[PDB]
Amino acid sequence: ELSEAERKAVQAMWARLYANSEDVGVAILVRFFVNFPSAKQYFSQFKHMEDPLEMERSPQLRKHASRVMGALNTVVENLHDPDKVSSVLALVGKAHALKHKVEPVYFKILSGVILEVVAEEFASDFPPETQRAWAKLRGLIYSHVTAAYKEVGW
Numbered sequence: 001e002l003s004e005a006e007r008k009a010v011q012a013m014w015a016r017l018y019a020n021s022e023d024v025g026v027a028i029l030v031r032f033f034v035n036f037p038s039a040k041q042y043f044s045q046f047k048h049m050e051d052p053l054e055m056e057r058s059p060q061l062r063k064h065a066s067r068v069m070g071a072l073n074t075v076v077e078n079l080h081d082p083d084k085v086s087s088v089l090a091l092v093g094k095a096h097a098l099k100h101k102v103e104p105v106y107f108k109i110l111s112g113v114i115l116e117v118v119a120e121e122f123a124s125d126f127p128p129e130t131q132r133a134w135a136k137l138r139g140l141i142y143s144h145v146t147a148a149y150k151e152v153g154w
């Protein structure tokens with residue numbers, strides 16, 4: 001789990017992100033789909049879309065952006081309550097394993113894009129203590145999502 005200082009570091013960072021949650025979520029996903037075109041295969045309204053301006057304006061992209069940011073928000077705000085973070089990430093993990101059939105490695109890829117976007121957009125607020133805290137959060141997400149895939153015999 002995150003230590004108290006790490007949790008505080010992650011929540012303070014996340015608050016800055018979430019002040020324009022909508023735009024940050026979308027910028028993250030556009031970068032994800034441009035840089036990893038294979039990930040678009042799970043999205044019916046944009047699986048063959050290439051123009052990043054259209055991706056930015058895509059209703060189904062912006063919707064998934066809103067749901068990624070909201071589920072992340074739930075995890076970050078409730079990091080002091082580890083049963084809640086377990087709860088949320090299971091539900092996500094399973095859902096993506098079973099309904100959406102997404103290869104679990106795409107979570108690792110998306111997290112790397114999330115890191116790249118955070119490092120760019122909020123660099124002057126991203127000291128090493130915070131970078132390390134954020135990296136623990138990423139590990140936490142990937143291990144919990146990865147355990148949920150194993151749980152239903154992926």
Ligand code: HEM
Pocket residue numbers: 039040042043060064067068069071072092095096099100102106107110
């Ligand atoms: C931090 C990681 C992610 C979070 C928190 C997240 C969150 C969500 C949530 C809350 C939903 C709506 C409920 C549901 O139908 O499951 C959703 C839908 C979906 N997600 Fe994710 N997601 C993540 C990563 C991914 C990745 C990497 C992919 C595939 C590359 C993906 C593919 C989908 C698809 C195909 C849907 C259905 C969208 C639709 O109904 O049009 N997600 N996501």
